Symmetry: C3
Subunit: 332 residues, 3 copies
């Protein structure tokens, strides 16, 4: 009887950060309430000033990570304000039935809806918009995110001992297919609707023009680099709603990796690089052992360094010469 269950309202935060939560559940099952507002907005995605009409959950690409526990109920109030122009909905890969909620959440501009589903399977899962007949257009315009459903007793290693993370980040990787004129310059449009048929042609090439973390080339760099300290245990959740990716931490590893993101399976150990299939979220756990700059990339290095799929960690602490040292610095 759902009426006798506690409700808890969560306010979401912008990626790559994640809302506050407990790893090990401190309560019985709850109805966890979330609200998201759909925003269609102009987004500048590269250093050249290329602009697209992005379609977002809550103003960000990706949409925010939602965190619950196994056998909680998720109740999502989804709002499409009348400032938008398109019909939208939501499909949770975590949910069972009705096209993941897609059949039940069709909202025109000016409408809202509330969906509830039981989180029966633990893991990280993609969610994404999926309106009838324009599914890939919405998804590849940025309308996707992820939800993590923790087991009620937290994460476990391959022997079933606890794994406790100190920090968690969410990296959403996005393939864009910006239409091009005859010479190869990116086209500009006043509304999303204008772009529709050129978008379809661009997608059909199967060749993205940009592949980015957190909505833009260089988004997870500089002042916006992810941070950690030597000794910290970090969980990186990574999603790709449409296309395969292969994350790699340059200078590090994935100590424990759920590459297809489902926590009832044991993790793969000591990964250099792992494959997250399109339409999947994965998760990797690493303990930092050396300070400095690390690059986190899609290890198709063209996709990383030319198309944009690269971010940085900056890690503080003490250098360990046992692990690595320059014996003779570069010299004639």
């Amino acid at each position: 009887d759902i009426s006798t269950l506690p409700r808890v309202k969560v306010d979401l935060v912008k990626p790559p950060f994640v809302h506050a939560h407990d790893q090990v559940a401190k309560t019985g099952p709850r109805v966890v309430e979330f609200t998201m507002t759909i925003e269609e907005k102009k987004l500048v995605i590269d250093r050249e000033g290329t602009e697209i009409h992005a379609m977002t959950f809550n103003g960000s690409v990706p949409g925010p990570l939602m965190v619950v526990h196994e056998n909680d109920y998720v109740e999502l109030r989804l709002i499409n304000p009348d400032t938008n122009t398109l019909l939208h909905n939501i499909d949770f890969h975590a949910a069972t039935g009705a096209l993941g909620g897609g059949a039940l959440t069709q909202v025109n501009p000016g409408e809202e809806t509330t969906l509830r589903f039981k989180a029966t399977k633990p893991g990280v899962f993609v969610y994404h918009c999926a309106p009838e007949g324009m599914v890939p257009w919405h998804v590849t315009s940025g309308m996707n995110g992820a939800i993590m459903v923790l087991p009620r007793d937290g994460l476990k290693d391959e022997k079933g001992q606890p794994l406790t993370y100190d920090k968690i980040y969410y990296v959403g990787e996005q393939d864009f297919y910006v239409p091009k004129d005859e010479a190869g310059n990116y086209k500009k449009y006043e509304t999303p609707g204008e772009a529709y048929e050129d978008a379809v042609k661009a997608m059909r090439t199967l060749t993205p023009t940009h592949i980015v973390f957190n909505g833009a080339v260089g988004a997870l760099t500089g002042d916006h680099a992810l941070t950690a300290a030597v000794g910290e245990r970090v969980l990186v959740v990574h999603s790709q709603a449409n296309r395969d990716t292969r994350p790699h931490l340059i200078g590090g590893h994935g100590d424990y990796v759920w590459a297809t993101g489902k926590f009832r399976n044991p993790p793969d150990l000591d990964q250099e690089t792992w494959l997250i299939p399109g339409g999947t979220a994965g998760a990797a756990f690493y303990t930092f052992r050396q300070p400095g700059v690390y690059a986190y990339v899609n290890h198709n290095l063209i996709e990383a360094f030319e198309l944009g799929a690269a971010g940085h960690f900056k890690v503080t602490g003490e250098w360990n010469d046992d692990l690595m040292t320059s014996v003779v610095k570069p010299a004639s």
Copy 2:
């Protein structure tokens, strides 16, 4: 001594259906006899009426699923009637030696041959045509299928308890590379041979023009949708002979997945999406919990919704509001 073993003749059925078989073996090892006839035929693959010269085992794309048990012998009579124009053969990934039977099964039009091999490894495996110097052309013209080699005691879960399916379907996913003129219209040819050099150029782009389940855009929809009932246990065998795919059941999961299809390994649990590498067959087990329409797709959603890699299940039975419910229907 093979002469003292029982023989059993099996008549194959059209995909997505699968010939009758026992999961748990009710006999000792047998020689299982199959016959296939090669058909070169014109196939219409999309709603626009695009036509290719398909090369088929038994008239279908994919070829039919063959089902045996571990340590049976498979004896295949392969017929190439003199109405065809090309040399063909067969390579079973399930078999050991002679290029999977390819070296021993070269048949010109008007010839036949009988191959026998022992099924030593349990799993689902691709089979495909592979004639010297035109391997990808034959395969990507539809000349592939799969064979399932069940363990003699049926399938097991990750703890080794029995898994029994109530229904089984075979989804063959096919990448086509239809040649195009300068403007981008699909070309037409009178014979397969005419197309050869344009086919090679089309393949080399590595960009398929269509990606389809069961031989055509929309083949597993409408009257041809796959069916099940709430509570039923369904095994979907999925093959791709040439290119990677990432299946996903929209509104469902892969409860138990052998993504690379080999049953001595434990299955991955609770998958949202899984990667089947090109040249592989995989298998996914799901128990339906909600009625309605489900879409089964390649979750590169461009490949699904624009290029054709999407089918439907229609599931009958009772709606469970505990799992999912609309709390507030879409409204102003």
Copy 3:
């Protein structure tokens, strides 16, 4: 205290062969010393005489396999002679910190450097050049290889019993992106530097013009085919520094496969085809059961047979009719 550890100098050999080593460690931890010389050289990559300016470790594509044990120290003297024109460095995916050694090994022509790192994780790992701002160009010009870090007690199967290989081969798979003029003919340049901007455009298509094993179309064929005998246990290490691949032994299997190459995980059994993500090394163990020619391919068969990703084994010994036999040879 590293000064009290034995040192051992290893001389590397050309791929596909691998330097001599012990599977089970016969000594305690050592400092293993290697030397590599960077060579920029003109390479002919196909039968048409297409030429590129390759960038190599030790003169080969791939660079040589290095073999150590878990918790050895690797000490690499890296030399960039003043006959080269570019700045180079090295990133080991096996190492921890400083961008895998990349931050510490930047050498202009005429410089050398010595790096030491501790091999803390067992597996096969990619190494590759990664200079600031031209990472994919160097990697996709051939500047990559792999290192294997054996567990001190050798390899184990999925039950933890020993697996001992009789032979080991290293297959490096390389994606090239040779620039093309308007009509589609490959361009030629006098220096590597000349090619830079055309290279970037070619890479951005994400479409390789060639995909080869060991540096050229047909390199592992004819007199250069890999060899084995029926009954032998063979380990094939396969790396791809930039793009996904899906190896398959035609006529065989991967009996034990570490597709993402990390030996603390149990192997997948009985694989037909397996996925090695870009930026990864994997390893497959097979025991030959039939003599003859086997083709080892990337099972995107366009990539294999049209673009070059195919090699051969030639296996000697006795034919086993129990496993496979022609019952009726091809006939009218």
